[PDB]
């Protein structure tokens, strides 16, 4: 995977909650997979998990933020990130930051993606499930509803 630093524009909590999900003491549907808030008011449209209103608002904005490389400015999951992996295919243009990858796919996963070439992101890959990341069967209709 190609990487970039994001254009300049919580962790403790996300980290603890992901541990609890992995340990089967919390459901991923009951946390905001983007920031870790427990004030879940909707379902994340791409991946199994919850989303808070504030994150929904960021997602709506970030969807339209692209860099001059033709790729999305920010992480698909958390709408931020410092360093992001870029999907190897051109109809995609998505990015995933190393924090969410190591956190949700697993420790080592980012570095493994960085050294996989060509690399297809978690939205493009045929398997659909990577660690805690579980792509929705119906993300296109969810995504459409989400933006309408």
The residue ranges that bind Zn ion (CB under 5 A) are 32, 34-35, 37, 52, 55, 75, 77-78, 81, 87, 92, 94, 97, 100, 121, 123-124
Instruction: Work out how close the CB of 25 gets to Zn ion at its nearest, in angstroms, rounded to a whole number.
Output: 20
**C-alpha span between 55 and 43 (Å, rounded):** 11
Give the residue among 76, 10, 87 at the shortest CA–CA distance from 49: 76
C-beta atoms surrounding 104 within 10 Å:
24
Instruction: Work out how close the CB of 144 gets to Zn ion at its nearest, in angstroms, rounded to a whole number.
Output: 18
HEC assignment per residue over 41-55: CEECCCECCEECHHH
Nearest residue (CB) to Zn ion, 124 versus 144: 124
Under DSSP, is residue 87 helix (H, G, I), strand (E, B) or coil? coil
Nearest residue (CB) to Zn ion, 32 versus 105: 32
Instruction: Work out how close the CB of 123 gets to Zn ion at its nearest, in angstroms, rounded to a whole number.
Output: 5
Nearest residue (CB) to Zn ion, 22 versus 82: 82
Give the residue among 95, 103, 42, 100 at the shortest CA–CA distance from 69: 95
Instruction: Work out how close the CB of 54 gets to Zn ion at its nearest, in angstroms, rounded to a whole number.
Output: 6
Nearest residue (CB) to Zn ion, 62 versus 97: 97
């Amino acid at each position: 995977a190609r990487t970039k630093q994001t254009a300049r524009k919580r962790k403790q909590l996300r980290e603890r909650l992901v541990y609890e999900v992995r340990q089967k003491c919390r459901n991923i549907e009951d946390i905001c997979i983007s920031c870790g808030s427990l004030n879940v008011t909707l379902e994340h449209p791409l991946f199994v998990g919850g989303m808070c209103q504030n994150c929904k608002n960021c997602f709506l904005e970030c969807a339209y933020q692209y860099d001059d490389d033709g790729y999305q400015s920010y992480c698909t999951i958390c709408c931020g990130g410092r360093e992001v992996l870029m999907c190897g295919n051109n109809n995609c243009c998505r990015c995933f930051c190393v924090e969410c990858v190591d956190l949700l796919v697993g420790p080592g996963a980012a570095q493994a993606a960085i050294k996989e070439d060509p690399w297809n992101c978690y939205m493009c890959g045929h398997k659909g499930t990577y660690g805690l990341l579980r792509r929705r069967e119906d993300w296109p209709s969810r995504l459409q509803m989400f933006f309408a």
